[PDB]
Symmetry: D2
Subunit: 325 residues, 4 copies
C-alpha cells in the first residue's frame, strides 16, 4: 500500500506568486496554501497518501528560532504516530539550511524528514516547485531513506542538512555541498543513494527540544579589512550568549577582532570562530581565542551553538559537539 | 632583453614559517623578507630583471584601508617609470581579494600588476609559494598580460581581481570564480589566456587615490535568522558612511533588518544589499530599501562602496558603478 | 521597435514529448514543431518579432556533419539579410556543443546566433524548455550580444560555444565550463555579461563553408588501460583523414597507442592528442607523436580538426589553429 | 606503538624526474625508487613503521590488467599478515582511478589501502608528492580509516575509488567527484571524515582474484556526431567479451551505433552504455540496446564489467552489479 506522508507548509517561494509568468523576482512568497500546491501536482497522490497541514506562510528570511523550535516539536509529534511514515516540509530557500539543520539535530526519529523549496515562484514559466515537490514526496516515502538524517531535496539532488547550503543568490542549481557532495540524486523516478554522512544526527543526537520555550541568543559577526571592534561591544552589551565569527580565511582575526573577542570572553560569552569563505575546515589554533567550527559554515555554526548552550557552556564539551555533529 | 619587474612584498603566508616542515597551521605569517623569497627561487632571475622592495610584513587579516591606499599610490609611482614593466605583489591570502580589487580600480596603467600568495608556509613540505612566485613573475613579464586589469596568480591559475575570491578556508585550490572562470592558466611554462573581463578597470576607471589620505567608513553586517536590529544602530552611531549587507539569498531582509536599514537611510547612511551565499546576482527590487550589489560579494562590495563615496553619495550614480565595475 | 529574430528548429528534447508529465526519460525527441514551441511561450512575441523555420526534427545524437554544414550555410544566408537581427537555434543537448562550435567557426557575422536546448521533454512537469527559449530570444535580440561568438543559452546561463560542454548525463544544470566560466547570466530579465572569450571566431575566422558539400572524415579513439592497437588499424583502413585521441591525463599514450599512432602517421593521417579527463590543457611534448589540442575537448577538437583539413594538412598550421580558435 | 605500513611502489609521476626544477611536463615517470621517495620525507617515519617494496616502476598509461591483477593479489597477501596494518600504493595519476577501483572490488580486508599520486615530478619546484605521501601514510595508519573501501589521497583530499576521477589534464587539484564529494579531508595533520559510500566493496564484494591469471577483454568506444559503425565490427572481430560505450548525453546512440551494438549482441558481446559527459546517471531505457552504467564513468565501468564477466554473462545479474558496486 501507499505510505502516509504529511506535507507541512511554512511558506516560501515554492508557494509564492507574481502578476506575470515571466516575473521571477520581486514576487510575493508564502502566498499560496498547501492544498493549492498539492492540487498543482496531482501525480503526487499516486506516490503516497498525502495530507497537507499549513504550519505557517512566510518568506523564509523572516523565519525565527521560536517558530523553528515549534516546527521541530510539531514534527516530533507527527513522527511518533503509527499512521505517519514520513514528512515533507515546504520552506523558503533563503534560510532552509538553518531550519533543516536545526531539525537534523532535534528530530528523534529514523523516519524521513524532507525539506523542499523552489527558486522560482509557482506562477513562473518553468517553475521548479512542482517537480521538486514530487521528488520530495518520492524520497519521503521510500524506505531506503530512513536513518539518513534530515534532507533537502531540490533540482534532482538530495542533500544532507549538515552540508548543503545555498551557494548562489539566484540560480536553480544554487544548492550544493562542494566538498561533501550529495547523499543521492533522483533521475527518471528512481532514487540513487551514494553517501551516508559520517556525523551524529537525529536519533543519536543529545539535543532535545521537548520542554524548551526559548533559545540562547547567538549573533554572527563578519571578518574583513578594518573590521570594527565596537560591534563586539554592542553584541555583549545586548546579552548574547554566543558569537559566531564569519572570519577571513581559516577563522583569522585582526587585532581589533581579537580585542573584541577577549572582551566577550571575560564577559562569559562563548566565541565560535568560523569562516566567511564558504567551504572548508577551520582548524584548531591555541594562539587564537575562541573555539573552531570544523566544517560548519556561519549559518549552521550558529544553529549548533544555540543548541549546545541549551546543554552546557563548557568550552571543551562544545568543541566536541562541533567535531561530531 | 629581460623585462624589469619589481616585487613588492607586504607579508603573508607566502613569507611565513613554522618550526617544522609538517606544520601548515599555526605558523607565523610575514616572517621572511622579500630577498629570502627571491633567493629561494633563483630561476626567477632568468625570466626577468627583478628588484625586491619590502613594503610591509604582516598577516593579511591586519591589512587596512590606510595601508592599501598607500600601496595603491606606491604602485602608481613605480608603473609611471620607464624602467619598470610590471609589478608582482606578494600578499596574504585572507584579504588578497580586497587589496587586489582596490588596486584593480585605482591603478592607472596598462602594465601588469600581479598579486601572488600561498596557502602553505615557506617552510612547509610541498610549499606552494615558490612555484606561485615563479608563475607570477612570468605573467607579469609577458606582454600578452597588458590591459587585463589586476590579476591574482596562484595554483597555476590566473584570476581577475573582480571575480576571484578565497572559497575554502584552507585548501591549495581555494581561489576560484565559480560563475566567471579564470582569465587564464599557466601550464608547462606557457600562458593560456581564455577570457577578458567585460567590466571597467584600471585606466578606464574614474577612481583616483592620488591625493586621498583616508577612506570613508564602511561596515559589513550579516543576514541570518533572528538577525538583530541593534547592530545597525551601533554602526550608525559610530559614523559609518555606508553599510554592506551580506544578506540571505538574493539580498533578502528580515523585518528587523528592514527597520535597521530604514533607520540608517534617514541618517544619511548608504545601504548596499549583497549576498552571504557566495556567488550570484543580487537583482534590483523596488519593494526593498538600499542599492543592490550586482555580482559583487560582501568583501568586494565594501571596497567599491568606499571608493564610490570618495566621489559621490548619489544613489543613482553608485548603483551605476556597481553594474559597470 | 522590436528586433527581428528567426527561430530555426532542428529537433531535440526541447521539442520532445512523453505520455505523462512525470516521464523525463525514454521520451521521443524532435516530436513537436517550432510553432507549437512558439505558442507555448507567447510572451516571446513581446521581446521580438519572431518567425519560426523548421530546419529538421531529430534527436541530436543523429545530427551529422552534412546536416550541420547545411545548417551553417542556412544561417549565413539569413544573417546576410537586413530584416534579420539574430537567430535562435533549437537543438538537442547531446551534441549541441559540436554543432554550436562548428557554427562558431563558420558563421561570418557579428549578429547573435544563440543555441537553446532543454534537459526535460516539453510535456514534463517543470519543463525547462519554455524559460530557456524565452531567455534565448532575449539574448538574441539584445544589441550587447553582438560580436561575442556563438552562444548556448540554458538554465539562466550564457556559455561560449568554444568552452561550454555537457558535463552531466542528465541534470538541468549540466552545461558548464569549469575553468572558463560563463560569458554571462540572465537573472530577472536583465542580461549580465561578464567575459569575452580571448579566441578567434565568426567574422575573424579563416574557415569558410560556402562551397563545401562534404567534410573530411575524423574519428575519436579512447585511451585507457589495455587500450587496443587494432582500433587504429581499423580507422586507417577506413580512410579517416584525422584521429582525435581522447587520452589518459594530458594526452598520454600507451606503447600500444604509440604503435597505432606512428602507423597512422606513416599513412598520412593527422593525429590530434586530446584528453578524456574533461577539462584542462594538453601541453606540447616532443617526446610523443601527434599534435596537442590545447584546451579543446575530444568533441570540440574533432570539429576544429575537420575544418582545418578543409584548408591544409600542414601540421605546423593546424597546431596554430588549435592554439588560437 | 606505531602502526606497520607497507609502501608498494608502482612508478608514476610521484617518482618521476626532469633535468630542471622548473620542468613540470615532458619528464620521465617511474624513474626513482621507493626508498628515494621514503628518504625524501623522513617525517613519515614518525607516523608509522614503514617498509618500501618496489612492485614496478612505470608511467601509469602503461599499466595493464595483468599487472593490476597481480598487484591486487600481492596486496591481499600483505593484508592477511598480522604485522601489516595498512598499505600505501604509489601510482601514476593517469590511470589511478582504474587500478584503485579494481582493488576496491577485489581486496578482501577492512585494513586501509591508500593510493597516492602526484601531478608534479619529484624534482619540481613545489612538488606535491612529498606532502601527498605524508598524508597517505597518516590516513593508512589511522584506525578511523578501516572499512571505508579503497581510497585515493592527494591535494589534502581523501576520495573513494568508486567516485574519484581525474577531471583535469594537468592541475594539482585535478581529482574530484563533483556529485559525490570526498570521503574526508586532511587539514593541519588531523583527518576529517565526512562521508561513507553507500556501495558494496572490499570485504562485501563477490569478486575474487585469487585463482585468476587473465581477465576478459573489454574495450571502450566513443559516441559523437558521425560516429562510425565499423569500430564495433572491429572490436567484435577481435574477440572482445564486452564493450563500454562512452555515449553522448545519457548513453544515447546514433543509428550507426545502434547497428553496431545489435551486431555485437547477436555475437554474444555484452554492451554497457555509459556516458562521455563526465558525471551523472545513465538511466535504464528499454527502447535502447545494452545495459546502463548507473553513475560509473567509462574507465570505472570497464573495470567492473571485466570483473563481472569473471562470474557471469547474465545481463540481469550484471545490471545488478552496476547498481550496487
Amino acid at each position: 500500500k501507499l505510505p502516509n506522508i504529511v506535507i507541512l507548509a511554512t511558506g516560501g517561494t515554492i508557494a509564492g506568486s507574481a502578476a506575470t509568468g515571466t516575473q521571477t523576482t520581486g514576487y510575493k512568497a508564502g502566498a499560496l496554501g498547501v492544498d493549492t500546491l498539492i492540487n498543482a501536482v496531482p501525480e503526487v497522490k499516486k506516490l503516497a497518501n498525502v495530507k497537507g497541514e499549513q504550519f505557517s506562510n512566510m518568506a523564509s528570511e523572516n523565519m525565527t528560532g521560536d517558530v523553528v523550535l515549534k516546527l521541530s516539536q510539531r514534527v516530533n509529534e507527527l513522527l511518533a504516530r503509527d499512521d505517519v511514515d514520513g514528512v515533507v516540509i515546504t520552506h523558503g530557500t533563503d534560510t532552509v539550511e538553518e531550519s533543516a539543520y536545526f531539525l537534523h539535530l532535534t528530530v528523534k526519529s529514523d523516519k524521513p524528514v524532507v525539506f523542499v523549496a523552489a527558486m522560482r515562484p509557482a506562477t513562473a514559466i518553468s517553475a521548479d516547485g512542482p517537480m521538486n515537490l514530487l521528488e520530495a514526496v518520492r524520497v519521503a516515502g521510500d524506505k531506503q531513506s530512513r536513518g539518513r538524517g534530515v534532507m533537502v531535496v531540490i533540482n534532482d539532488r538530495i542533500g544532507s542538512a549538515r552540508y548543503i547550503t545555498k551557494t548562489n543568490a539566484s540560480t536553480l542549481d544554487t544548492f550544493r555541498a562542494n566538498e561533501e557532495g550529495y547523499l543521492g540524486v533522483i533521475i527518471g523516478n528512481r532514487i540513487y543513494y551514494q553517501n551516508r554522512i559520517d556525523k551524529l544526527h537525529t536519533t543519536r543526537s543529545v539535543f532535545d527540544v521537548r520542554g524548551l520555550t526559548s533559545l540562547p541568543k547567538v549573533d554572527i559577526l563578519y571578518g574583513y579589512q578594518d573590521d570594527p571592534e565596537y560591534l563586539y561591544d554592542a553584541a555583549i552589551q545586548h546579552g548574547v550568549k554566543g558569537i559566531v565569527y564569519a572570519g577571513m580565511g581559516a577563522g583569522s582575526v585582526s587585532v581589533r577582532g581579537i580585542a573584541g573577542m577577549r572582551k566577550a570572553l571575560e564577559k562569559g560569552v562563548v566565541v565560535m570562530r568560523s569562516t566567511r569563505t564558504g567551504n572548508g575546515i577551520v582548524p584548531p589554533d591555541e594562539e587564537l581565542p575562541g573555539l573552531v567550527s570544523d566544517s560548519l559554515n556561519p549559518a549552521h555554526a550558529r544553529i549548533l551553538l544555540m543548541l549546545a548552550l541549551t546543554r552546557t557552556s563548557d568550552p571543551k564539551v562544545i568543541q566536541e559537539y562541533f567535531h561530531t555533529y
